[PDB]
Amino acid sequence: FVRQIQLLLWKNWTLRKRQKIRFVVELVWPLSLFLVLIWLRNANPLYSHHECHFPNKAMPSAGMLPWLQGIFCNVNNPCFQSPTPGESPGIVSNYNNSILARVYRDFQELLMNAPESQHLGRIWTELHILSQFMDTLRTHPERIAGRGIRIRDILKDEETLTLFLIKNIGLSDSVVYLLINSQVRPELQWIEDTLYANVDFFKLFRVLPTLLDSRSQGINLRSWGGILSDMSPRIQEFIHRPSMQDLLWVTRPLMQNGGPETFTKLMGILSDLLCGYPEGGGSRVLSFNWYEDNNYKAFLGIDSTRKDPIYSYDRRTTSFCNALIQSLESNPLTKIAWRAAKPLLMGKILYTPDSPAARRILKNANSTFEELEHVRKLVKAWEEVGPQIWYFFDNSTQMNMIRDTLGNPTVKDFLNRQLGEEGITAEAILNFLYKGPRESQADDMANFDWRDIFNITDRTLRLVNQYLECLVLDKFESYNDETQLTQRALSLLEENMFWAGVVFPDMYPWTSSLPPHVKYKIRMDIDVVEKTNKIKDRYWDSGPRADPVEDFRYIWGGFAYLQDMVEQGITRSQVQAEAPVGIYLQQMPYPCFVDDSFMIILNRCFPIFMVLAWIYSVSMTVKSIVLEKELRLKETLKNQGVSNAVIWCTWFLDSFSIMSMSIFLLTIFIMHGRILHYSDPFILFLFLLAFSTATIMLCFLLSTFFSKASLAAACSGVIYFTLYLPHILCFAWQDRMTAELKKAVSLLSPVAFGFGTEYLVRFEEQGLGLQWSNIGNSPTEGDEFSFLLSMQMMLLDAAVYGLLAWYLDQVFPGDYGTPLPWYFLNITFYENQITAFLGHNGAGKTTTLSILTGLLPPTSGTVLVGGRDIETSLDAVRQSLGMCPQHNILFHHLTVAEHMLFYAQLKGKSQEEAQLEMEAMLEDTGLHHKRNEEAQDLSGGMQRKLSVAIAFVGDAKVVILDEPTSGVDPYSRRSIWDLLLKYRSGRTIIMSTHHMDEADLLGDRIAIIAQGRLYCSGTPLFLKNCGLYLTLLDGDVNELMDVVLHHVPECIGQELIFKNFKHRAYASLFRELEETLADLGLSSFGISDTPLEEIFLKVTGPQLNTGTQLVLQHVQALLVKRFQHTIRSHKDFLAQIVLPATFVFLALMLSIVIPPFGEYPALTLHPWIYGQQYTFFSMDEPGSEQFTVLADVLLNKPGFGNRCLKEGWLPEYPCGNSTPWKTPSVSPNITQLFQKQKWTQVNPSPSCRCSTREKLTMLPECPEGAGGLPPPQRTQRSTEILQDLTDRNISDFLVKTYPALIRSSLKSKFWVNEQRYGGISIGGKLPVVPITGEALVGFLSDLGRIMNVSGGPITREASKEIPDFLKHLETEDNIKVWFNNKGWHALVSFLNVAHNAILRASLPKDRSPEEYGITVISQPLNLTKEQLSEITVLTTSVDAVVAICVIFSMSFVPASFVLYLIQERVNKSKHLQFISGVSPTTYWVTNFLWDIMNYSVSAGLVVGIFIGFQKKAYTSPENLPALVALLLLYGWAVIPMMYPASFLFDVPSTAYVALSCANLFIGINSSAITFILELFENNRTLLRFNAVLRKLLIVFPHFCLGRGLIDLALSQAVTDVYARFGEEHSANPFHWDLIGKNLFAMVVEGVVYFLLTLLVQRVRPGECFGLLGVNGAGKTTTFKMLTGDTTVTSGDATVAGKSILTNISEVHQNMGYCPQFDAIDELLTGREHLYLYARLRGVPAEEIEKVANWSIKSLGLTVYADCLAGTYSGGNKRKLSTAIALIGCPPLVLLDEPTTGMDPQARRMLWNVIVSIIREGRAVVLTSHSMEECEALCTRLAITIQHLKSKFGDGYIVTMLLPDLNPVEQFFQGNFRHYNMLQFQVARIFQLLLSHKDSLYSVTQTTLDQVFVNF
């Protein structure tokens, strides 16, 4: 039966290709969402970074110098691709390439390790010291061997020349002594100088300056000269070394009046001066996960900076310090860094107990601050040592002696021993003592001397002293309890002088001795510490989480530093021993990650968008199927011979074709839009095609539930969207499913699509992206769901949906034969001419018809020559065809020629045969001229003509019909008669209807036998004889009637009514009547024969109220009506009482499930806050006993942390058992790889291949090697696995095994256990200076003894504790604490672990380390008002979403009202009420009143729901009336707002969906815009915001309600905030500033919209007039003009009798033309027996409680009177409509189409009621399209029944074996075709022929049917 598929598919394609709006939308709308996705993809570029190795971070326990150097160097936390030096096992110092370190290295290499130069330098040192000692006069304490007491010796004073001299024989004093005395003296004399005795310059003899030291021998030799010129080559090599040259080249801008960049270039110089990091100084990685901190300001671009503090005058600092603070805070450039650094530099630390134990702990922790104070004192000592240096370089006596030695004749070696050694001798005179005391002029000092550098060094020292004085080093303030703290801390945070509060619990103010286990809490500001309510990063981000400022609050906030200080103080308090070990937190290395945030969107937006891509489409598909079912058109196909599965097969082919085109376009769009980079387009195409197939099965399944096309189209999209939501619910609980409950949930197609696209996103994060070889593999490596199973089970869902849809369609059809069980006498009449079976409906005629249809199986009878339809179902289905039912069976959009082709090819035939048949159109249907016209374009007569002609498209021998012309136009009835007669073809045509006139002329070979038992055969000749009436204002015809009655032996007004033919008597009466016609007033004459309808009948105060008594009664009636309509209807109950209730309940669930945003409790800060993890251990320096015992007390005895304390640490964390050491088993080829190949230290293991710029992977693909040879494991007693990373490359192992660890964890990427958060490397020795302090003090004292600089109080105070300063400057023994920053509280917890290990290692022999420990707790202080503002913003955003949901829920009830109103308006029920006498004002007022009542009930229910939650924001006593007012007034204002939607729209379900969408859109926009634009505190949009709030959006009641709820939430939040702070709040609604504005706006807007709605609203007494003068003219327009439906004045002048106006009755408009029953059932279809009550209580007018008395209106039908109006059939419905139309006894009765399809008996009852009414004296005017009903019901008035026939061209019709007909024809021709019946069209000859009947029958005049103005 493939031809059926082909034909139905062609039909479906032809209908689909003509809509031209669904076609384009179904292809464009899905593309728009993915264009949005493309834009999002372009707006979210991926962030890729290389391998990250981070520099070591020192701690205060490691000494001031490493700690500060780390602080300065690692301000950016740089990423180095190569491992840092600190990551090596034995070394910790990354400052190896710094210029200072290299200069120090060269200093040791050349000077310290010189060739025994130390000995020579020392010898020179004691040489100078001995010379200085000899320089001292020491009064007379001299050896007296030589006259050298004092004053440059006294040789002249004491010698042999004293007194008279002459001791040496002939000694003379300046008298040219012949003999010179030399025995008593160590060394031509005359008065004149330069003589023979004065030949020597100074002293020729005794040139040695030693002079045996003048005491105890020890003469100073030339050892100083020997050392001289030996230091010169080494000094030159040191100076010319590249390190020293680099030092000079970088230091030139420094220490000068330069600094071109005040801070940018200074940092650049200081970096390579102190840090010297490789690469370009490293690079920082940026943390983009702003949503993890709830930092909405960062996303929106708001500044998010706290308010600046006040100047606070000067405080206790210096003027320079205050100026610096004010400049730093005021400068916008440097206020952020200064804000971060101020608590550290100048802040206070507060401790609560104030106990002797606490004071001891803090004194021990003070070490860093004593060290800083010592540095400050050392710098301050310059103030009193600098002038001494300057004076020493002034005269003094040492510098003068040096100058004299240089000033000696030739200065011994004038050119120096090291001649030409780049050093001039004048450098000892100038540039060292230039110009003596002072320079002669500016720049005359050779520009470089002692003072030239003295100013620069003095200025630098004084400036650094000034800067250092701006520091607070007495940071510890003692309080009494934690209540006094957090109050001082609040003020300090206000002025930014608070570091932390170190509160010690479990210890009283009098506690002196420390407990073995010490707990303490560090209380920080929440802005400088990680939040304690969250420990992980939620959504796992590919990245190291290593932004220096964004996610290192523990470092730069001072938490880690203070924790280290406090724990070190506790350690020193407990152990009472010197075991100095530092801490070197070192972040774990990270591999080549790729951060693609767009995947998040792709993980959430891709499914929903796809669903939203089909919503409209799915609706249309359903709108097709139900449209084939509601139009009784699927049953037409089933009668035609479809299989009930070929139709759905073709529906699939059509829908699948359109969806396949759409999916092809979407796949091309996605691939070329770079939404998916690394995916094969074919698998994505197949995934989308499987989703499409599941969607089409959803369409088929949903089409069975519904029976109305419009409702199905409106609601199918709603079900389709709703079905996806379970996926959203399951995504939050993704870990809950165990691949079995997930399967159960995924029976829904959207949920399975969501799972599949989740797997797609997971594969797209990698470089694979759903290839053919990985669809069946789950990337999580632990889930059995996979992705291929997703597509397969979506196909399974499609099959299940289709099967269940087929089952339901078979079992629950619309109206047809249904197999409820779970399956999965009689003869033939004449066979020629147009036979007609006439009978009452339901009396067996329909049963005989159905038996003849073939539907009911034939029993003991033959439908045709085939024997039986039961015996031969295939036969008599092609010939016995053309089944024309009462329903018009056509297509909405298909063409007439297309109908002909489709129906000709459906019943056999072929395309050529169908085309040939369509060519023979047999005229009609506009011939071939109207071929291109669509079926809907054709008029009703044309539509029915085509429907009947469709029966003759195929060659059909038997064409049985059912009312071909039941309600067709009279001209159209003639046309259909001509078409049907022209297609007789000798066929057994059978037609059945209640219209006998249709069988009068076109009916031949009549057989009215369907009477239930075939009582009468009813052949036309036989039916004729089962008498004739005579037709002819004078009023005297009563006497004339007797004459005619006597001549030929039912009278009414304006007319005359009165075998065995009696020709002689009849002809005599006819001649007498014709002769007397002139005398009488009759204009014409006629003859009436026996009607065919009668043949079938053979078997069968004032009562009226006036004035104000109306309106009140009016409203009651209307109220009552709607009351009934809201009791019978249950849809109006679910759409008004529960739907808002359920949505509000869901919204409140959402509100209460969200956790509070500002809890921040105390966190115990231990590594086991993360459950299962690997912690690693490295042992370096095994020789040290201290490190061995530290490893012992770290590994097994107490273990890590404090979980094992021998006395119970935490009940929630018990201690288990420790497994023995075990190296994990490894694959054989891994060992082969590691043994066969060569691996060096630089390349110890295979390298992970990360992103290659063309295949970007989230993490590198690590080969089988990775770290390699897994380390031994222990499964520590703390239920955590310890790895032994001893003698192994820790950095390589970590960075290459991290991906393997994290692949297992990231099964969901929502709460990941990285299984590795920290580790300990016990080792790393920092080289220290060998000065040892005391030697330095001795050297400085000796130097100060050489020249009397001495010192003062400051120098002595500085020198008191130099050895302690040197000891605390740096720490030699150290331990590294590796931490993973992706765990937030990781580094602090492992500081705690390391300090516990250090404390346990230092314990004495006794006092077992099991019990000792330290516990750190992070408990942030109470939030400030600025932070509480953000918390309030978050909470009120949740409340705003709740308010939006409340608006959306409450908008349903007014929508239900609008659907009621539109349903009442469309079916003209509202117009009927207006016609009866309901004024528009009264109608709208009572509708508004009832709507307010219903909404009040619904809002009371919603208020009950709210109060059931005890929400303080809304349900508090001061807010409950507010919430009630908001709800009630919102409804009361929004109901009139959408009243006009009744006029705008015409379809109820469409109105519901459109109004719900509009309300949701308006509500979300109104709430969100005002809630978001108010967040921008400092902007120019605020005015814009106000232009949105006060004026723009206040018009919408949605905005009023939403802003009211939001403002209530904000007011309650701020009231709670002030109550927490104790300031209290007014909290008074109805103030016009909080909520009163919205209430007044609602009050005004309700009235305004109600007025807008009211503005939108803007014949003789006894003769029936048949208003059918022109059929083509719009009589419906005339009736509307006579009624209130149309106000067009372009019409004829008419009056209602009582009043005359433009609208006839416009002058009065009261109780005029009361009935207006048109060709429409103006029934509410929900009220029973109340129509006669509603249409009488006051609606026509109040009849004074006479409702029961006026029960006569129930004469037509009393059995169905008490049943629902929609419950019973159309005949009873229209009988009730007519009864309520003429219920008020009006003078004028309007009737349109007086009787539609109804039983002839009921039609007779209606006609007798009408004629009785018109005889009573009530005027009736009637119109009809059948026009057969006008006869015998309407009076002489017509648009004269006999007069019209006579005036128009017409005449009487005369009707009379085979040879016997010849005499009749010959006789008939004498006076003036079919077998046994002659139809001759034709007065004197007629009378004569009647008398001559024997020589040769019934004769009737022209009827109203014949010649109905054909023109």
Ligand X SMILES: *[C@@H]1O[C@H](CO)[C@@H](O)[C@H](O)[C@H]1NC(C)=O
Q: Is 49 annotated as a binding residue?
A: no
The type of residue at 1030 is: L
Q: Is 542 in the site for ligand HZL (CB under 6 A)?
A: no
Task: Please choose which of ligand HZL, ligand X, Mg ion, none residue 1422 contacts, taking the beta carbon within 5 to 8 angstroms, the exact cut-off set by kind.
Answer: ligand X
Q: To the nearest 5 percent, what fractions of the chain are helix, strand and coil?
A: 50, 5, 45
Task: Please choose which of ligand X, ligand HZL, Mg ion, none residue 1348 contacts, taking the beta carbon within 5 to 8 angstroms, the exact cut-off set by kind.
Answer: ligand X
The stretches of 1078-1184 forming alpha helices (DSSP H) are 1092-1099, 1109-1128, 1131-1133, 1139-1153
The stretches of 509-595 forming alpha helices (DSSP H) are 553-556, 559-575
| Smallest separation (angstroms) from ligand HZL to the CB of 725 | 15
Helix-then-strand count for the chain, H and E = 66, 24
| Smallest separation (angstroms) from ligand HZL to the CB of 1526 | 22
- Cα-based torsion angle of the residue sequence 1392, 1398, 1400, 1401 in order, rounded to the nearest 10 degrees: 160
Q: Is 1671 annotated as a binding residue?
A: yes
Which strand (E) or helix (H) includes residue 1174?
strand 1174-1179
Exposed e or buried b per residue across 1553-1575, where buried means at least 16 C-beta atoms within 10 angstroms of its C-beta: bbbbeebbebbbbbbebbbebbe
Q: Is 604 annotated as a binding residue?
A: yes
Q: Is 1770 annotated as a binding residue?
A: yes
Give φ, ψ of 503 to 5 degrees. Answer: -95, 130
- Of the listed pieces 241-249, 1378-1386, 1404-1412, 1432-1440, which binds ligand HZL according to CB under 6 A? 1432-1440
| Smallest separation (angstroms) from ligand X to the CB of 1422 | 4
Rounded to whole angstroms, the Cα distance separating 1670 from 1686 reads 20
Site string for ligand HZL, 765-794 (x = CB under 6 A): ------------------------------
Q: Is 845 annotated as a binding residue?
A: yes
The stretches of 1817-1857 forming alpha helices (DSSP H) are 1841-1847
Closer residue to ligand X in complex, CB, 405/1812: 405
Q: Is 930 annotated as a binding residue?
A: yes
| Smallest separation (angstroms) from ligand X to the CB of 442 | 22
Closer residue to ligand X in complex, CB, 305/1229: 1229
Closer residue to Mg ion in complex, CB, 289/1612: 289
| Smallest separation (angstroms) from ligand X to the CB of 806 | 49
Q: Is 264 annotated as a binding residue?
A: no
Closer residue to ligand X in complex, CB, 116/1623: 1623
Rounded to whole angstroms, the Cα distance separating 1866 from 1857 reads 16
Task: Please choose which of Mg ion, ligand X, ligand HZL, none residue 287 contacts, taking the beta carbon within 5 to 8 angstroms, the exact cut-off set by kind.
Answer: Mg ion
Q: Is 287 in the site for Mg ion (CB under 5 A)?
A: yes
Strand 1413-1418, strand 1788-1792: pairing: unpaired
Q: Which residues bind ligand X (CB under 6 A)?
A: 388, 391, 394-395, 397, 486-487, 1227, 1229, 1348, 1422
Q: Is 886 annotated as a binding residue?
A: yes
Q: Is 650 in the site for Mg ion (CB under 5 A)?
A: no
Q: Is 315 annotated as a binding residue?
A: no
Q: Is 1324 annotated as a binding residue?
A: no
Q: Is 600 in the site for ligand HZL (CB under 6 A)?
A: yes
Task: Please choose which of ligand X, ligand HZL, Mg ion, none residue 1439 contacts, taking the beta carbon within 5 to 8 angstroms, the exact cut-off set by kind.
Answer: none
Among 358, 1398, 1433, 1854, binds ligand HZL (CB under 6 A): 1433
Closer residue to ligand HZL in complex, CB, 635/1574: 1574
Among 172, 418, 597, 1304, binds ligand HZL (CB under 6 A): 597
Half-sphere exposure of 1841 (CA within 13 A, CB side): 28
- Of the listed pieces 1-9, 551-559, 1006-1014, 1546-1554, which binds Mg ion according to CB under 5 A? 551-559
SS3 626: helix
Closer residue to ligand X in complex, CB, 68/1346: 1346
Q: Is 940 annotated as a binding residue?
A: yes
Residue 156 is given by DSSP the state T
Q: Is 532 in the site for Mg ion (CB under 5 A)?
A: no
By CB under 6 A, the residues from 1522 to 1581 that bind ligand HZL are 1572, 1575
The type of residue at 647 is: I
Residue 1378 · residue 1178 · CB < 8 Å: no
Give me 1767's structure tokens.
Answer: 């419950």
Rounded to whole angstroms, the Cα distance separating 771 from 776 reads 10
- Of the listed pieces 140-148, 295-303, 767-775, 1675-1683, which binds ligand HZL according to CB under 6 A? 295-303
Task: Please choose which of Mg ion, ligand HZL, ligand X, none residue 551 contacts, taking the beta carbon within 5 to 8 angstroms, the exact cut-off set by kind.
Answer: Mg ion
| Smallest separation (angstroms) from ligand HZL to the CB of 713 | 30
| Smallest separation (angstroms) from ligand HZL to the CB of 602 | 10
Among 514, 566, 601, 1802, binds ligand HZL (CB under 6 A): 601
- Of the listed pieces 288-296, 953-961, 1190-1198, 1847-1855, which binds Mg ion according to CB under 5 A? 288-296
- Of the listed pieces 555-563, 915-923, 1204-1212, 1434-1442, which binds ligand HZL according to CB under 6 A? 1434-1442
Rounded to whole angstroms, the Cα distance separating 1491 from 1537 reads 13
Closer residue to ligand X in complex, CB, 673/1158: 1158
- CA 605, 609, 610, 615 torsion-angle sign: positive
- CA 655, 656, 662, 666 torsion-angle sign: positive
Task: Please choose which of Mg ion, ligand X, ligand HZL, none residue 1438 contacts, taking the beta carbon within 5 to 8 angstroms, the exact cut-off set by kind.
Answer: ligand HZL
Number of residues that bind ligand HZL (CB under 6 A): 20
By CB under 6 A, the residues from 1137 to 1156 that bind ligand HZL are 1154
Q: Which of 1210, 1216, 1218, 1197 is nearest to 1169 (CA)?
A: 1210
Which strand (E) or helix (H) includes residue 1706?
none
Residue number with the shortest CB distance to ligand X? 395
Residue number with the shortest CB distance to Mg ion? 287
Among 84, 289, 1011, 1638, binds Mg ion (CB under 5 A): 289
Q: Is 190 in the site for ligand HZL (CB under 6 A)?
A: no
Q: Which of 1509, 1502, 1520, 1504 is nearest to 1449 (CA)?
A: 1502
What are 630-635's contacts with CB under 8 Å, separation 24+? 630/707, 630/708, 630/709, 630/814, 631/887, 631/892, 632/815, 632/885, 632/887, 632/889, 633/889, 633/891, 634/814, 635/815, 635/816
Task: Please choose which of Mg ion, ligand HZL, ligand X, none residue 1151 contacts, taking the beta carbon within 5 to 8 angstroms, the exact cut-off set by kind.
Answer: none
Q: Which residues are bridge partners to 1666 per DSSP? A: 1822, 1838
Go through the chain and tell me how many residues it has: 1911
- Cα-based torsion angle of the residue sequence 606, 608, 612, 615 in order, rounded to the nearest 10 degrees: 130
Closer residue to ligand HZL in complex, CB, 834/1144: 1144
Residue 1417 · residue 529 · CB < 8 Å: no
Give me 533's structure tokens.
Answer: 């309510």
Task: Please choose which of ligand HZL, ligand X, Mg ion, none residue 851 contacts, taking the beta carbon within 5 to 8 angstroms, the exact cut-off set by kind.
Answer: none
Show the beta-strand stretches assigned E in 1366-1453: 1374-1379, 1413-1418
DSSP 1530-1567: HHHHHHHHHSTHHHH---HHHHHHHHHHHHHHHHHHHH
Which segments are annotated as binding site for Mg(2+)? 287, 289, 846, 1676
**Sites of contact with ligand HZL (CB under 6 A):** 40, 43, 291, 294, 296, 299-300, 539, 597, 600-601, 604, 1154, 1433-1434, 1437-1438, 1441, 1572, 1575
Which segments are annotated as binding site for ATP? 842, 845, 847, 886, 930, 940-941, 994, 1671-1672, 1675-1677, 1770
**Sites of contact with Mg ion (CB under 5 A):** 287, 289, 551
Which segments are annotated as binding site? 287, 289, 538, 604, 842, 845-847, 886, 930, 940-941, 994, 1671-1672, 1675-1677, 1770
